[model samples]
Target: LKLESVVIVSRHGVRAPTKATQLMQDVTPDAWPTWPVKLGWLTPRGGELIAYLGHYQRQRLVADGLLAKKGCPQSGQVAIIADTDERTRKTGEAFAAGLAPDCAITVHTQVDTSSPDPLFNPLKTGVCQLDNANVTDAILSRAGGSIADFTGHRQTAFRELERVLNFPQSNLCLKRCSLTQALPSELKVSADNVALTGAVSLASMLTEIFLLQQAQGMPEPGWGRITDSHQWNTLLSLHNAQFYLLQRTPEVARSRATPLLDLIKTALTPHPPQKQAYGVTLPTSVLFIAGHDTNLANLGGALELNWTLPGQPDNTPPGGELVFERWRRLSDNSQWIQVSLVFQTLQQMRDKTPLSLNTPPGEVKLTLAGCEERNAQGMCSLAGFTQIVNEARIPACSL
Candidate 1:
């Protein structure tokens, strides 16, 4: 088989907490560990980590015969579209730095730099809108009824969060300190947003902070309390559950993912159905997208795909990637599409491990939930894969 092209939809690398809200501070008595960078910016360590992925990917591309073993790739051979955020843009830059050490590769973004790119933030950009009633109903239904019913099953995790943050001694405890003691979760919905507020949501955010801390290689993680893998997974369950409810719910995912998936479909297609929306032809052998974990969750839900990274607790951890590959059979001249989830393992992230072809990042092949027309290698024909994407897409959600 001849490797044809690849597209990667990747979450930005490790970043400082997106925000340090008073609420976040209120949940713990201990002072939050300081980050080397400002809130939400990718750390130098994060850039180095993603650069390692790029280097490993470069080796794989060379092994697969997509590029020359030594020289820089020719023009149009590699393309990158990074979201309009500091972390994402820097991720693209870092990856390019490692992918081609001395090559001057330009990482592109949509023309408008001040606003969120619709390709990444369809709901936030108003390119796609969600119905509040549908959002509420879908989330509640997924939760099995009320938000309370959903969170009711997670008391142990919530208590675990309490211990991690030492919530008993926190100022918030003066009113109600324990995560378990918070008010019932409430569904918050609007045309472009949906979320849960209260205990589970709090646990979600706090746990995510712990994850970032671990990834950042802080001297003390979870205030040195997250000692075991089981504890890490337990805390991350709340984070994963929250993303599943808000970002991966079918209605919400469809609404948020349509635009991005549309772009992916076009990029992967040898002959696209229409002109590319972003005013660029993806003639490159590789197309890299620096997006967010929520984007991955949306794609997962929209495509009816499910996966759990082997060594990472969060379903969509920092810098995780959903990679799609197109390969052509030399004898038959037929193309197949294969998808995989790839990422640095939790230990690798924490250790800032470097990668080579022999010691590559962890990867897992993913099967389309309803597509059975696959070969022994678990790849679908180009036409079949395109049809699957089209079927999963919601036309109403497209701009």
Candidate 2:
């Protein structure tokens, strides 16, 4: 197969925890770790990490003959857009810097810089609205109709989290202690976004902070309480579960992912229709979108995609990406589509490892449930991919 074009929807690189809530702080007696950047802002190391990936991508694409081995790309050859957040904007610039070191490549944003971009977050932008009743039902269905039961099933994981945080000796425990008790979880749907409260939400915050700490190269993670992968996986289970229920549930995913998926399909289309929500200009060679982990989870849910990256417990780890490639058969000239997840392993991210053709990032081929036709090489026809995109979309949710 001959490579034709490529598109990527990527989560931004590592950053400080998005927020520091009183409840999150009260959950543990130990002090929260300090981060170099402000809350939710990307770190210098994080930018450097993305640049490494960008350089690796450039080398691989050059090797594949999709792009020239030398010099800056001409105007229509490449396009990059990012969510308006500081982290995402920085990530886009960093990736571009690495992709073409001496080239002038401007990362573009379609919406107002002050507000959330509709392309990345339609629900928050009010481009689409979700019914609260439907939202609750959808989340409950994923949680087995009862939040208590969901928490109960993960009782052991919660205990592991407490061990990592030393919860029994925490300030909250001074107010009220427990013998591995399962804390209550309350799911709240609002005009802004779907949210969780109580134990599960708190655990989610803690685990994410721990992950950022590890990724930031802190001397100790989980206050040096975490010892092995088992403990890491067990603690991260809560974070994963929270995201699965809130962001990856079918109804929520369909609502939030419609515009983004539409944009992605348009980016990959060789000759896309002009009529679309974002009015995006398709790049001839490469497209890179700097977004959030939630975007990846939403796409995973909407497209029925599942993957597991080695040495990284979070399915949508910081800087992880969903890549789509178009390839043409030599004889028939008919095109095929390939989908995969590319990411740096936890060790790679933690060490800020440099990647090259000799040492590349982890890449796992992804299967599309909607696309049944596949070749021996595991690639589906481009027509099959477009059909699945059409099938997966929720028309009412369109912007």
Candidate 3:
């Protein structure tokens, strides 16, 4: 099979908490280090790590002949599009710098970093209609239990991690609700509905903060809080579940994925009714879309993907990458599209390390759930994949 176009959708690298205290200020006594970057933007370490990933991406792409090794291979146009946020825009630049250093490569963005754009927001999206009131029962129906109860079941571990960080759950609000249930002073709708961080979200957020610190190799403040690797990962999983709560279900998937589904389909669309749409031109080869974790989750749901990488309950990490490839069989002229989930291992993520050809990122082929055509090798018929892509065009939110 001959590899055709390649598209990479990735989560941005490590970043600082949105708030310095991040809901832990009143509860925690220990001093947390102040960072240099603007709030919600990528840090210097983050930039460096992404650049390394980009360098490796270029190497891999070049190996596959999708990219040229030397000065502007002139093979396929490389377009890197990022959301209009401090973290994502910088991430796009950092990635391009690594992917094509010394070669002119453009990083495309929707708006100024300060301005909010609807297309790239994963945590919250105004693009589609979501039913908030039905959340509790809806989630329970889909996953076979209440989201509130689900979070409740995981609290012992969360409490242990919380104690070590010196941040206790002072207010029961954080401990008693589902992720879709917003906190006080909430204004927006989150995954299913009613936006703002949820109570259970606190555990997910606080645990991750230390994970980043640990990854920075920061011995200070402490590591004793989580000696066992599973505990650390389990805490991380709680946070990841918020997205699972939001996008894993069918309703959420169609609604949240509308814009990105349009964008991805337009990019991968071999022939379009119009000459161009969604920034994709005819015959485009490689596209890199950078956004948040929920966007990543929405994408998997939109595509009906199921993936397993050993030791990762949810394969999304700080710098996760998912690649979709179009391939053609030379002998029979048959074509197949393949999907893969690739990410930095706990070692790589914690250490802020870049993947190497010798020590590549964890790779797993994915099978799109409900689609019989896609195989374990991730090969699916272009026609079958195209049909699924078209069915994802959910209508926008009505006034």
Candidate 4:
């Protein structure tokens, strides 16, 4: 298992928000910054940052002697695959531009653009082993059997946001909602007619919009509550919680990420006879899979890993990466692996700074929970990791 392979699963770079509309406009104290790019497409600035990261990776890997410095890869040496989203495909392209600027590069995609990619959209296709019931139950059990308390805890921060989106049911004025609000998990509607769902996520979206604008020198609005950092941080937490519940929670993550884990198992430890019988050949020294933050959340959940990268929790930022490496001892042929989750700081994303290995982006090594000991190199053995995966106690994958 000596340096057998590497797989990089990366989130796409900074891009225009998927939903850019009146909420962003009406709530901002000033005009929201306009994006020249279409919704969700990587921006020119975002592309440049990822290219810098790509160049950074090339230098580090080449220094490690894992890749050549100035030549095209030999056949089967490298592979780049992206989920068929405009943003992800372009992300692969930009990274390739920096990794092998002079060579012909092809980005592979396994699913059609309009269809849900199982790796990221497993639950939507009804092929996963868990669902809302199991996931909801899991959450309830973790909350001391009180889901309403959990929901109410996150709902308090979204008041200003309610004024912005003005959910059809919400008729109250800004900064005002009825006291005695219903338990969040018990009712979908609140006194302001706030949907009690996705509100903090909406706040997060608005917060980033402001941050991005401020990074670009947007003037302070005299009336905008989001201008206050105290409120903004609260919104960020709420936003992060939504992502956590929908994807990173154990029950949901283990089920939704099975397809992705299957790919990892095959790539890292493929049975050659089975692959041959199936007439497939995906062997490679380097592999790249382009995906989204949810992919990161789901995979992190499946692995039961939690890490903080320098001033930030496990929130996935633009162009973040969850990297996997395979290492084998040269003397005894023993194999070990390391998983690292990396991301840009909030300011770096807002500032659109180029990331270098020694620079702003943060990297944290992730150890499989409950599977550490006797290995001093911060790597886990294959057997130990397999047990950890099995202990997730998930049902069989749909396919």
Give the TM-score comparing model 1 with the true structure, all chains together: 0.96
Model 4, residue 241: distance off in Å is 1.5
For model 1, the stretches where C-alpha displacement exceeds 4 angstroms are 272-279
* Model 3 alpha-carbon miss at residue 269, Å: 2.8
Q: On residues 131-243, what C-alpha lDDT tens digit does candidate 2 reach at each position?
A: 88988888988988878778878888888888888888877787886423535668888854898878888887788778778888898999899888888778778888998
Task: For candidate 1, write residues 1-399 as lDDT tens digits.
Answer: 899999999999999988777878887889998899988999998899999999999999999999888988987688888998999999999888888988977888888888888778677877667888878888999987887778778878888888888888888886765565555678889888997887877788889889988998888899998899999999999999999899889888987888888888878878743335555566468888998999999999888778888889988988898998998988889988888999998899999889998899999899877676777788888888888888888887776
The segments of candidate 2 whose C-alpha lies over 4 angstroms from its true place after superposition are 178-183, 272-280
Q: State how far residue 32 of model 3 sits from its true place (Å).
A: 2.3
Better of 1 and 3 by TM-score: 1
- Give candidate 3 regions above 4 Å deviation: 111-113, 121-126, 133-136, 142-144, 167-198, 221-224, 272-282, 308-314, 352-354, 397-399
For model 1, state the Cα shift of residue 281 in Å: 2.5
Clashing pairs in 3: 174-199, 188-195, 189-195, 190-195, 215-350
Locate the minimum summed-lDDT window of 10 residues in model 1.
272-281
Question: Per-residue lDDT tens digits of candidate 3, residues 1-399?
Answer: 777688888888778777765456544545666656666778778777778778888888888877778886453377778887778878888888888776656667754556666665432545555766565456555533655566566666655655665454334334543223333212244444533245556655666676666655566423356676666666676666665665565566666666777677566656643434334454567788888777777778777886545644345666678788888778777777788887766667566666778767778888766565764465778877877877765655311
Query: Each prediction's TM-score against the native?
Result: 0.96, 0.95, 0.85, 0.81
Cα displacement (Å) at residue 17, model 3: 0.8
Give Cα distance to truth, residue 362, candidate 2, Å.
1.2
In model 4, which residue pairs have backbone atoms overlapping below 3 Å? 1-328, 2-328, 170-192
